[PDB]
Every structure is written in structure tokens, then in C-alpha cells.
């Protein structure tokens, strides 16, 4: 067929009940994730093609970058809680991988301050149990699929995107193939 299990996607042998409809994982340490988000704009182009009533969830992971990797999962929880993902995603990626100016939790915080989140607001969120809960939700979702690599995207707890089964000669074509595959999977 045009879409084939093992080609554009794979099928989880242990399906996850109650999983987010479309679930993306990344790390700000992850070089391919930098490409996915900053250059390919995968999340945006996937979202722009999702059926009505299909929501997209994006979570950070701990298994890259040690201590700072865990700090970034907590900062991503702050970003989600405050709803400022679209303000901090670029400077966090660039801070970690382009300028390499993010070396500590304080450096992460500076990115939010520069993006206009007030210091008191950031610190209250950082220390909040709402954010602890969001951190737990990120960890649980990744654990549910035994996640050991990023970038990764899952659909309905059942299917995992397989971008290695896609032509990478043209960036634009690759992105819409990925997006069309997520749409196809969500409609299964
Ligand atoms: O996910 C995959 C599979 C193979 C490579 N990658 C990562 C990547 C990074 C940056 C650009 C491309 C790309 C896609 C079409 S033209 C250039 C692909």
C-alpha cells in the first residue's frame, strides 16, 4: 500500500491506552530535534494538517544532557504552564546548540526573562507543584513508550513515525510527507 507499517511508521507492540492523540518528544540537546524544529518546522506543519478535534502535545525528555537536560524538562513544564512555548523554543534551542550560552538553570531562566516572562512569574512557576505535575506527565508519557531516542512522534499510543523511511533530498517535500503520514495515522 502507499502507507506501510515498517515504512513511514511502525506499530507499537505494546499499545498505550489513553495516550495523547499526537505526541511529540524532543530534547533541546538533540541535534536532529534542532533541525526538526528550527529548520524543518515539523511540529508546525504537522499541526497545520491535523484533522479537526485532534490536538498536539509536545514534551521534553531527560535522557540527554544530564543535569541540565532535567532542568530543561522542568523549564519546558514552565513554558507549558505559562503558555509561552512559542516565545522560548527558538532561544532555548539556540542557547543550547548554537551559541552554547545555556550551561546552568540560571542561564535557562535568563532566556525566559529576555523573552519577557517576569522573574517572579518564572520563579513561582518553576517552584510550583503544577509544574512538578507537568514534569511527571512528561516523564510518564516517555516511559509509557520506553522512549530512548528523539525526535520521536507517536499517534494515538499506537503508531510511531519513521522518518528514516522518507527522501531527504528536498526539505519541503520531506516535511509534508511527514505531516501527511501523521494525518493518515490519526485518521486510522
Ligand atoms: O529525520 C531525518 C531523516 C534523515 C535525516 N533526518 C534529519 C534531517 C535534518 C535536517 C534536514 C533533513 C532534510 C530533510 C529533507 S532535505 C534535508 C533531515
Rg from C-alpha positions? 17 Å
The sequence of SSEs as H and E is EEHHEHHHHHEEH
Number of spatially distinct domains: 1
Form type: globular
User: Strands of the biggest beta sheet: in what spatial order?
Assistant: 1-5-4-2-3
Distance between the termini: 14 Å
Percent helix, as a range, is 40-55%
Structural class based on helices, strands and sheet pairing: alpha+beta
Ligands in the model, by name, code or SMILES, are:
1-[(3-thiophen-3-ylphenyl)methyl]-3~{H}-pyrrol-2-one
> What's the total helix number?
8
Number of β-strand runs: 5
Strand content: 5-15%
**Biggest β-sheet, characterized?**
5 strands, mixed
Subcellular location: Periplasm
Pfam families: DSBA
Protein name: Thiol:disulfide interchange protein DsbA
Disulfide bonds: 30-33
Amino acid at each position: 500500500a502507499q502507507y506501510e507499517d515498517g515504512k513511514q511508521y511502525t506499530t507499537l507492540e505494546k499499545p498505550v491506552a489513553g495516550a495523547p492523540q499526537v505526541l511529540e518528544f524532543f530534547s533541546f540537546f538533540c541535534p536532529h530535534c534542532y533541525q526538526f524544529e528550527e529548520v524543518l518546522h515539523i511540529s508546525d506543519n504537522v499541526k497545520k494538517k491535523l484533522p479537526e478535534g485532534v490536538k498536539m502535545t509536545k514534551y521534553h525528555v531527560n535522557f540527554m544532557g544530564g543535569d541540565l537536560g532535567k532542568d530543561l524538562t522542568q523549564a519546558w513544564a514552565v513554558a507549558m504552564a505559562l503558555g509561552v512555548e512559542d516565545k522560548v523554543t527558538v532561544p532555548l534551542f539556540e542557547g543550547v546548540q548554537k551559541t552554547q550560552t545555556i550551561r546552568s538553570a540560571s542561564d535557562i531562566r535568563d532566556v525566559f526573562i529576555n523573552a519577557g516572562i517576569k522573574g517572579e512569574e518564572y520563579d513561582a512557576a518553576w517552584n510550583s507543584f503544577v509544574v512538578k505535575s507537568l514534569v511527571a506527565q512528561q516523564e510518564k508519557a516517555a516511559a509509557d513508550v520506553q522512549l530512548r531516542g528523539v525526535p520521536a512522534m507517536f499517534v494515538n499510543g499506537k503508531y510511531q513515525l519513521n522518518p528514516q523511511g522518507m527522501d531527504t533530498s528536498n526539505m519541503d517535500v520531506f516535511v509534508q510527507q511527514y505531516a501527511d503520514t501523521v494525518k493518515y495515522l490519526s485518521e486510522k
